[PDB]
Amino acid sequence: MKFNPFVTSDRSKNRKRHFNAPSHIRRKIMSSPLSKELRQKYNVRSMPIRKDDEVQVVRGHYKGQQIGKVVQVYRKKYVIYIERVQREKANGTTVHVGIHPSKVVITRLKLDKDRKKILERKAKSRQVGKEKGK
Amino acid sequence: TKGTSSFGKRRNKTHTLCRRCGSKAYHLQKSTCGKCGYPAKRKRKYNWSAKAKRRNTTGTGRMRHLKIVYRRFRHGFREGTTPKPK
Amino acid sequence: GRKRPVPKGATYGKPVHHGVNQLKFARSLQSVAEERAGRHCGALRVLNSYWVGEDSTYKFFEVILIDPFHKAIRRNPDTQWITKPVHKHREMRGLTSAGRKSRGLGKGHKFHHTIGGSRRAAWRRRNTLQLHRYR
Amino acid sequence: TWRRWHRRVNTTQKRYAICSALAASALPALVMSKGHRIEEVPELPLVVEDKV
Amino acid sequence: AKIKARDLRGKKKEELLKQLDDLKVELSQLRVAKVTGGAASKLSKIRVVRKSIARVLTVINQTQKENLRKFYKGKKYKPLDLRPKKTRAMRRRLNKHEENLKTKKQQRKERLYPLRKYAVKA
Amino acid sequence: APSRNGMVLKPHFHKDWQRRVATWFNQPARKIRRRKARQAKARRIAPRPASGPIRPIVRCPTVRYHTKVRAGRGFSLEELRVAGIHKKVARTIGISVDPRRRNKSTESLQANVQRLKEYRSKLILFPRKPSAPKKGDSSAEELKLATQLTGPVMPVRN
Amino acid sequence: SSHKTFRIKRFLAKKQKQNRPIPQWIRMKTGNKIRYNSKRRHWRRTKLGL
RNA sequence: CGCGACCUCAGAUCAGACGUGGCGACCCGCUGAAUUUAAGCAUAUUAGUCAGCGGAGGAGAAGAAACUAACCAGGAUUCCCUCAGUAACGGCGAGUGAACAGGGAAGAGCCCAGCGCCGAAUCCCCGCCCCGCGGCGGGGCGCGGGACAUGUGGCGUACGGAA
RNA sequence: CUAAGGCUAAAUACCGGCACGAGACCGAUAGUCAACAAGUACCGUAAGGGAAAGUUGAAAAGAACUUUGAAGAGAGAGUUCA
RNA sequence: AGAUCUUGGUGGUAGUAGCAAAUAUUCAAACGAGAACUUUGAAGGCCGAAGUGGAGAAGGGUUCCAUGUGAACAGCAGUUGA
RNA sequence: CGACUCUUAGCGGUGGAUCACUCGGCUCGUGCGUCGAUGAAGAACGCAGCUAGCUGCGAGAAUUAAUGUGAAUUGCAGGACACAUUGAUCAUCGACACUUCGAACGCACUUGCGGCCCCGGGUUCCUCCCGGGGCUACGCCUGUCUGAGCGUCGCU
Ligand SMILES: [Mg+2]
Ligand SMILES: [Mg+2]
Ligand SMILES: [Mg+2]
Ligand SMILES: [Mg+2]
Ligand SMILES: [Mg+2]
Ligand SMILES: [Mg+2]
Ligand SMILES: [Mg+2]
Ligand SMILES: [Mg+2]
Ligand SMILES: [Mg+2]
Ligand SMILES: [Mg+2]
Ligand SMILES: [Mg+2]
Ligand SMILES: [Mg+2]
Ligand SMILES: [Mg+2]
Ligand SMILES: [Mg+2]
Ligand SMILES: [Mg+2]
Ligand SMILES: [Mg+2]
Ligand SMILES: [Mg+2]
Ligand SMILES: [Mg+2]
Ligand SMILES: [Mg+2]
Ligand SMILES: [Mg+2]
Ligand SMILES: [Mg+2]
Ligand SMILES: [Mg+2]
Ligand SMILES: [Mg+2]
Ligand SMILES: [Mg+2]
Ligand SMILES: [Mg+2]
Ligand SMILES: [Mg+2]
Ligand SMILES: [Mg+2]
Ligand SMILES: [Mg+2]
Ligand SMILES: [Mg+2]
Ligand SMILES: [Mg+2]
Ligand SMILES: [Mg+2]
Ligand SMILES: [Mg+2]
Ligand SMILES: [Mg+2]
Ligand SMILES: [Mg+2]
Ligand SMILES: [Zn+2]
Numbered sequence A: 001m002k003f004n005p006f007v008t009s010d011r012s013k014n015r016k017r018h019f020n021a022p023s024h025i026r027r028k029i030m031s032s033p034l035s036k037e038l039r040q041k042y043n044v045r046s047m048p049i050r051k052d053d054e055v056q057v058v059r060g061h062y063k064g065q066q067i068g069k070v071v072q073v074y075r076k077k078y079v080i081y082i083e084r085v086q087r088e089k090a091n092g093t094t095v096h097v098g099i100h101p102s103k104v105v106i107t108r109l110k111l112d113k114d115r116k117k118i119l120e121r122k123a124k125s126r127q128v129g130k131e132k133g134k
Numbered sequence B: 001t002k003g004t005s006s007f008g009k010r011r012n013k014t015h016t017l018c019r020r021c022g023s024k025a026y027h028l029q030k031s032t033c034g035k036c037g038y039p040a041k042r043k044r045k046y047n048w049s050a051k052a053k054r055r056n057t058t059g060t061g062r063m064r065h066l067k068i069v070y071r072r073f074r075h076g077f078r079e080g081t082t083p084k085p086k
Numbered sequence C: 001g002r003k004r005p006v007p008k009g010a011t012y013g014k015p016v017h018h019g020v021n022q023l024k025f026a027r028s029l030q031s032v033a034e035e036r037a038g039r040h041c042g043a044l045r046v047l048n049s050y051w052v053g054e055d056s057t058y059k060f061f062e063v064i065l066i067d068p069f070h071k072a073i074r075r076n077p078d079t080q081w082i083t084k085p086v087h088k089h090r091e092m093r094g095l096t097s098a099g100r101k102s103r104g105l106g107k108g109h110k111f112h113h114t115i116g117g118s119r120r121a122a123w124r125r126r127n128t129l130q131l132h133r134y135r
Numbered sequence D: 001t002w003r004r005w006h007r008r009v010n011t012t013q014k015r016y017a018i019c020s021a022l023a024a025s026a027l028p029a030l031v032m033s034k035g036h037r038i039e040e041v042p043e044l045p046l047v048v049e050d051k052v
Numbered sequence E: 001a002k003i004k005a006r007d008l009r010g011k012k013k014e015e016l017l018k019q020l021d022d023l024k025v026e027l028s029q030l031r032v033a034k035v036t037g038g039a040a041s042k043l044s045k046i047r048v049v050r051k052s053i054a055r056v057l058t059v060i061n062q063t064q065k066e067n068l069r070k071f072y073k074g075k076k077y078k079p080l081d082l083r084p085k086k087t088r089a090m091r092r093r094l095n096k097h098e099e100n101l102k103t104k105k106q107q108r109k110e111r112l113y114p115l116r117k118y119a120v121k122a
Numbered sequence F: 001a002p003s004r005n006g007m008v009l010k011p012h013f014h015k016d017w018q019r020r021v022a023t024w025f026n027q028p029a030r031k032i033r034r035r036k037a038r039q040a041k042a043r044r045i046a047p048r049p050a051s052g053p054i055r056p057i058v059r060c061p062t063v064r065y066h067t068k069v070r071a072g073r074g075f076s077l078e079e080l081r082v083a084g085i086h087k088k089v090a091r092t093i094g095i096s097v098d099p100r101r102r103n104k105s106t107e108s109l110q111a112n113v114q115r116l117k118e119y120r121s122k123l124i125l126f127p128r129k130p131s132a133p134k135k136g137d138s139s140a141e142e143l144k145l146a147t148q149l150t151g152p153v154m155p156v157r158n
Numbered sequence G: 001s002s003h004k005t006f007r008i009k010r011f012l013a014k015k016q017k018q019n020r021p022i023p024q025w026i027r028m029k030t031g032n033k034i035r036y037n038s039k040r041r042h043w044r045r046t047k048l049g050l
Numbered sequence H: 001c002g003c004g005a006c007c008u009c010a011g012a013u014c015a016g017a018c019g020u021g022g023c024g025a026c027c028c029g030c031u032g033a034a035u036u037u038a039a040g041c042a043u044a045u046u047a048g049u050c051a052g053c054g055g056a057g058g059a060g061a062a063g064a065a066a067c068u069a070a071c072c073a074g075g076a077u078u079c080c081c082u083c084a085g086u087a088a089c090g091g092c093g094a095g096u097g098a099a100c101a102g103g104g105a106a107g108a109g110c111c112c113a114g115c116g117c118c119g120a121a122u123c124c125c126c127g128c129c130c131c132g133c134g135g136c137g138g139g140g141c142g143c144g145g146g147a148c149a150u151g152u153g154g155c156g157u158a159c160g161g162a163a
Numbered sequence I: 001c002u003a004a005g006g007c008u009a010a011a012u013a014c015c016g017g018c019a020c021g022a023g024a025c026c027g028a029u030a031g032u033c034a035a036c037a038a039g040u041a042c043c044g045u046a047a048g049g050g051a052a053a054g055u056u057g058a059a060a061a062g063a064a065c066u067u068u069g070a071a072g073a074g075a076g077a078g079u080u081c082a
Numbered sequence J: 001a002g003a004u005c006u007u008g009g010u011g012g013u014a015g016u017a018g019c020a021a022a023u024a025u026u027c028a029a030a031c032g033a034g035a036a037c038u039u040u041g042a043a044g045g046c047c048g049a050a051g052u053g054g055a056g057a058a059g060g061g062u063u064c065c066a067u068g069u070g071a072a073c074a075g076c077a078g079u080u081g082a
Numbered sequence K: 001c002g003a004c005u006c007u008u009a010g011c012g013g014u015g016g017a018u019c020a021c022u023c024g025g026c027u028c029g030u031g032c033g034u035c036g037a038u039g040a041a042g043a044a045c046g047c048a049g050c051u052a053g054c055u056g057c058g059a060g061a062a063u064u065a066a067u068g069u070g071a072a073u074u075g076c077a078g079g080a081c082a083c084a085u086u087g088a089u090c091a092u093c094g095a096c097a098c099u100u101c102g103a104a105c106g107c108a109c110u111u112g113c114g115g116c117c118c119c120g121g122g123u124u125c126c127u128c129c130c131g132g133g134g135c136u137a138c139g140c141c142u143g144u145c146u147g148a149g150c151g152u153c154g155c156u
Helices: A011-019 A023-029 A036-041 A113-133 B050-055 B064-073 C029-040 C097-103 C109-114 C119-126 D011-024 D028-033 E013-035 E040-071 E088-092 E096-100 E104-112 F027-044 F077-083 F106-122 G006-017 G024-028
Strands: A031-033 A046-048 A054-057 A068-074 A079-082 A086-088 A094-096 A104-108 C045-054 C059-066 C129-131 E117-120 F021-023 F057-059 F069-071 F123-126
Touching: A031 A104, A036 A104, A046 A113, A054 A079, C029 C045, C029 C059, C029 C097, C045 C097, C109 C119, E013 E040, F057 F106, F077 F106, F106 F123
Parallel strands: C129 F021
Antiparallel strands: A031 A046, A054 A068, A054 A104, A068 A079, A086 A094, C045 C059, E117 F123, F057 F069
16 A cells, blocks of 8 residues: 555545646646557557547446547536537537546547657556566 | 813824835834834734734735745746747 | 832732832833933944943933944954844843843853853743643 | 543453453354354464475 | 747847837837727737746846946955845855964964874773 | 452543544564665774674662673773773774773773773784775785674673 | 715725626636635625725 | 055945834743831831833743752752741831752753864855756755854863873 | 853754645534635724634536417426436 | 523514604606505795705715616615615 | 503514524544745735626736536626537646735835836937836845955065
8 A cells, every 4th residue: 555655545635736736747647548559559558638639438427438539628627528429408509518528538539749759658667667577 | 081071182193104114103102113113123923913914914914025036936037038930 | 229110109900010119110211211222222232341330310421333334344253253143133132231131131040040051041941730641 | 631541450450351352262152142253273372384 | 929038148239228128119009009099919918928028128127237247357345235135134144254264372282282083992 | 330340440541532542553564664774874984893893791770680790882992001902093903892890890800901901812803904904904804704793892781 | 975085985986996796707717616706795784995 | 655465443325134113811031119017217128029121932031050068968941749938127116038859741951162182173255167946955066256263173071082 | 169251052942934745533503703705794983802604516517499478487398316 | 391491493462562853745747567665747845054955174085976786775665865 | 432551362563582404614534734025914006798706817917728527607698619620618727917006125105206228100310309128226145357454565
């Protein structure tokens, strides 16, 4: 279990840190697992969610294998919006239903130099860990 | 009449706003603030009212300079340096 | 001596505290002169003082002051100690020779009042109830 | 805060309690009565080699 | 078409002041548009122009201050804003040279009787 | 009010004691801090004994305790003088000195100087320059025979 | 009164400016917990500090 | 009947520095009650405590014996245990009340004045040059100013010291 | 033992501050006065006194539309697991 | 279950006391869902220049002015309002 | 028959107890232990497109720069942002800036009024008016300059 005396296991402290986190670590908190194919291609497990990557929902009312592209990462409400994940309201307009990024799986990554750089960084750290623990 | 009738005669302010401490306790006729004692160089403060002390102690306001001092202390009060340019 | 500063000599209380005259200040007049010199010259440090004359109504003392920021003082060891921040207004804390005499400091059986550095230190030590973890 | 939270026990009594606890750990009925599911343990004073 | 702090530093003082004046004029016109109805885009452009003015002003001030620092480098007396501002107490304390210098008696002691490295057999 | 038989008790709780009560909840923390400081000091003086300088043999003053013997503050200057050790060099080689202690009797004097001679025999002196051994000791007896001493140096034993 | 000092007029100006209702879009914000301006002052209900 | 030297003073928006005020849990110096207890109450107690004033620092204060002792003697200060609710104080009533030795935590010692000796050996400031900047120092120079014999510096301080 | 001169770290103290960790504690009349725009609203000329006030839902999906009423307010309909 | 207990909530009283100091209102019309109370007109009165008039000081601080609303307040009402 | 009253129950009101929760306290412990004339603490006034409070900030005003990060902020709107001819946001914070009172510092304040030196303009150097910049507190130390004394003297 936790042995470091400088990290807290207090429930109130953890919840206060989570619900008052700045957006630059709300990005880290709002991470999503990669698909098995992506986990095989890139030697990483998770990835912070991003504006224009395509995910599918694995829990809740919108479970399915349909692939929808993310359209908004609403870090203030800890949710993301997807293309066809939406509902009709009273006046007939459609509103996006916010679902947690931990309840989706990323099936295609929106790639630029920063995402790629983070990808080799995570993969190299995991490889170093595997070689150490071999 | 010591009651209602005499309350109609009050039209002359004893106290005004104090330029120090911003409190409506500056006796106009004595030229002395009843809360801070403004013309005195030292702040009026007494130990028989801890509530009065904590109403106006350090940290109850802005601390424009003390915040920076607290932040600057954690890096040894370094000056004349900048982070390595990218 | 030190007359009690009460209006019309009325000290309201038990008769043991009715004294107004024949009362004495706990600090010597030399300490008072040192304190006045230090208070007027707040940027200087009182070192010592000595007796130069007295009258029926006045005592005269000459107080040695040191400017702690002169380079002659500041560049000289065995004198840099007075430049430390802890050594400011010594005469107001009773750390000069004239101020120290009224504190009852010393070694041996005559000075049991101030074991620990001061009267208050000894009083706190002797009046604190040490409640250990295991009684 | 000065509730006397701590108690001091005689050292001989603490050693006595340790001895009684050890002696009761070698009796299958008592360890069973603590609910420890010893039904296929080969020997209750269970001793393994130093390789562990 | 924002302005950045990096590409302002190469410019000299005259065109920096010219650009600051143009930004001030544009901000005044944007405020005029704000009080006369205007459009939402011009209302949003107020903050952009204000931050651009702040950028130009801080570049000018930093260049002036560093030029003054280069001018007063190596001089005995410097303006108070160019001196370090560690802490009043830290500024009153002794400098390293007069902190670490010793009397002749003390260094004679350290020369004659230095502390030795030793061990004791059990 | 007294009640039947009992002891006349005089509690000293008439003086607002609750404002000055010293609790000991930081006692384990204080012990941890003290041990950490001890280990840091022992690491600082690496080959030097952890407990510190050697102390003299000293008889307890009064008639209650004069049969016992304990450790004193430092070696008297006469003990150092007849032991052949300078009073300013002794502190550099870990000998505690006490200029204000006198030697009333010759027996304590001789005991303390045998103590000093034994310590000087057991001392290993490292040269100031490791590559230049001037007069301290041979390199062989300080290669592996040097080791930090735990506990008081030559403990005083009745 | 009609005669007044500059500081008094400025104080009254600020007390005028901060005596207004909340904007309507405040209640649309995430985690509002604000229903109305609870520091509203009326010139006849309560009197100012000066 | 003017010009100089010194002494004692004064002015300056003179050159360069410094102090003020805040916090104030802990610390240092003063000032300092009464409620209360005594089954009343005045000494006493509360208590050198509350209130009041001043001054600091990350700690402060104390501190290297004009000490404890009476022993076969210990050996700066500070803190803990114990001495000890004891010696003692007290309308000897209510109540108050240490210290030495002992065991530990820590452990560190020193500097002047004075008596002297050494061609004031001493110190500050202003100009110039070089090395540096990063807390403003190092070296060299000035028939450059000042302090200083009404005493600066080196040796040296009771454990003795010097020649 | 050597007063009427001076310095000195450690062990020690810490209900203020900066930043942390924990608890056989309290659980919105409790625990700080203050879990919330709290030393705030408000009271007193002033010194100063000083509150009350937590919870829709998983997600606003916060009741489109029809209908009586001048409206508040209703009757249907609708969202929701409710 | 008590403490003329603390804080909060709720009854009977009870649709009760009461909305009675300073002479006084009436007719028509307009707006308006709605008029004893608003507005206009007509009439009858009152303050009667030491005023129920016209303007200031102190004090208040936006109460001033126009437009809009009819939730709450103006101890009945309101289409009116500080 | 009804009304009224009482008892009990169903349902509906009033009220917010109980229960569950908890970004809050209280207590203990640890490491640091740092303010200010280079203008502190405190106060006032301002600053957002829509903003009253809280918060943040100071006329560069809900922030500039720099560094790290790496695509958002979000209640609405707007507009950026090839993320490489460099980057939204957030964090850090060492550069810059930091209104008025306040030890508060030209004098004074429930108001206002000066003086000195430079610069620009109206003037067309001369000092009147306007604007801008820098100074102008008390105490005290070392040094400097200017002095005072029927203080002590020397020469004349
Ligand atoms: Mg009366
Ligand atoms: Mg009056
Ligand atoms: Mg008495
Ligand atoms: Mg010397
Ligand atoms: Mg009124
Ligand atoms: Mg000057
Ligand atoms: Mg002070
Ligand atoms: Mg009594
Ligand atoms: Mg009684
Ligand atoms: Mg009585
Ligand atoms: Mg006090
Ligand atoms: Mg000290
Ligand atoms: Mg001392
Ligand atoms: Mg001595
Ligand atoms: Mg006993
Ligand atoms: Mg007593
Ligand atoms: Mg020890
Ligand atoms: Mg000499
Ligand atoms: Mg509460
Ligand atoms: Mg509840
Ligand atoms: Mg209604
Ligand atoms: Mg339900
Ligand atoms: Mg009850
Ligand atoms: Mg009636
Ligand atoms: Mg009636
Ligand atoms: Mg008539
Ligand atoms: Mg009439
Ligand atoms: Mg009139
Ligand atoms: Mg009106
Ligand atoms: Mg009504
Ligand atoms: Mg019910
Ligand atoms: Mg930036
Ligand atoms: Mg006036
Ligand atoms: Mg003369
Ligand atoms: Zn005031």
